[PDB]
Write a structure and sequence with these properties.
This is part of a larger assembly, with 2 copies of chain A and 3 copies of chain B (48 residues). Chain A has 1 helix and no strands. Chain A has 47 residues and is mainly alpha-helical. The longest helix of chain A has 40 residues. Chain A is rod-shaped and about 70 Å long. Chain B is 56% helix and 0% strand. The radius of gyration of chain B is 15 Å and the shape is flat. Classes of the chains: A mainly alpha (47), B mainly alpha (48). Chains in contact: A-C, B-C, B-D, B-E, D-E. At the A-C interface, helix 1 of A face helix 1 and helix 2 of C. Chain D: It comes from Homo sapiens (Human). Chain D: Microtubule inner protein (MIP) part of the dynein-decorated doublet microtubules (DMTs) in cilia and flagellar axoneme. Forms filamentous polymers in the walls of ciliary and flagellar microtubules. Contributes to normal sperm motility. Chain D: It is found in: Cytoplasm, Cytoskeleton, Cilium axoneme; Cytoplasm, Cytoskeleton, Flagellum axoneme. Chain D: This is Tektin-4. Chain D: Belongs to the tektin family.
């Protein structure tokens, strides 16, 4: 029974997981909308 | 005849580009994504 | 009470990550289709220019359309490069999202095991009353 | 990695798509990784 | 008999550790070799 932890580390780990998931979802949303804008501009220019 | 050879060259060029894109990929590469059905990715083909 | 609150928040985040991953896959497919369309336009421009080079002597002239075709070819090449770069960026983002989804699922499983242990202890402590 | 390689090789245009030794190697790699995965899952169950 | 039970359980556990270690090492070496073979075949198909 070597490995032991403390109470606030558990809460900090859960908060860290939630924050990381939220930030990466926001980054994915930004990348999606920038890609859509690029697609529209390139299609218009080619036509 | 030159136009026929031109079409052959275009096909070879596109096979080259696709094969370089395939050969770029490595083990710890983040452009690799999952694609399930290898049976559907296999298609009837002609011999080299 | 504390552990079930954490479990509920984890389940909500997992659902949101799943739907975001699906939408990003859809946008990746759309980008691939646009890349193929740009490739077809490039093929059309190249064959138009080389077919028009077949003009006979003296008439073979540097008219106004040749500069437009060359400029259009260069613009299409720049478009292809930009689309490939954006596709690579989108694939990077989706891979990162998949890794975080896997981590959230493993943490959910550990929390479920701990809830099972605590309610088993609660069911064990009934004989003492 | 192998699944994405097969999906990208499936896009070869017109006559260039072929039944290659690369295709045979990729299919053998996919099935061999599947066998290793199955053995690794059963070892995980035994450890639990 | 109870001490025998505890000792036998410990012995079975450590045997399973040993066996799992060899299985993991073998699968890792096999996967690396197959990936190297696939990349070399892709390069040859480029040069042709």
């Amino acid at each position: 029974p070597s490995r032991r932890f403390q109470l606030p580390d558990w809460h900090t780990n859960s908060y860290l997981l939630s924050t990381n998931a939220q930030l990466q979802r926001d980054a994915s949303h930004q990348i999606r909308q920038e890609a859509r804008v690029l697609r529209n501009e390139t299609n218009n220019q080619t036509i | 005849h030159k136009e026929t050879c031109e079409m052959d060259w275009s096909d070879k060029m596109e096979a080259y580009n696709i094969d370089e894109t395939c050969g770029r990929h490595h083990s710890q590469s983040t452009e690799v994504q999952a694609h399930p059905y290898s049976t559907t990715f296999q298609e009837s083909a002609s011999t080299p | 009470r504390e552990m079930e609150k954490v479990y509920s928040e984890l389940k909500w985040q997992e659902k949101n990550t799943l739907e975001e991953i699906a939408e990003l896959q859809e946008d990746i497919r759309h980008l691939e289709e646009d890349l193929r369309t740009k490739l077809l336009s490039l093929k059309l421009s190249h064959t138009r220019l080389e077919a028009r080079t077949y003009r006979p002597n003296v008439e073979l002239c540097r008219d106004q359309a040749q500069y437009g075709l060359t400029d259009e070819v260069h613009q299409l090449e720049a478009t292809i490069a930009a689309l490939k770069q954006k596709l690579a960026q989108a694939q990077d983002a989706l891979d990162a999202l998949c890794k975080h989804l896997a981590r959230l699922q493993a943490d959910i499983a550990c929390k479920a095991n701990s809830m099972l242990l605590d309610t088993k202890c609660m069911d064990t402590r009934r004989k003492l009353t | 990695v192998a699944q994405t390689r097969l999906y990208l090789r499936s896009h070869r245009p017109n006559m260039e798509l072929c039944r290659d030794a690369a295709q045979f190697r990729l299919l053998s790699e996919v099935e061999e990784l599947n066998m290793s995965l199955t053995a690794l899952r059963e070892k995980l169950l035994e450890a639990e | 008999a109870r001490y025998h039970q505890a000792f036998a359980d410990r012995d079975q556990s450590e045997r399973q550790r040993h066996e799992s270690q060899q299985l993991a090492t073998e699968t890792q070496a096999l996967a690396q070799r197959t990936q190297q073979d696939s990349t070399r075949t892709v390069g040859e198909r480029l040069q042709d």
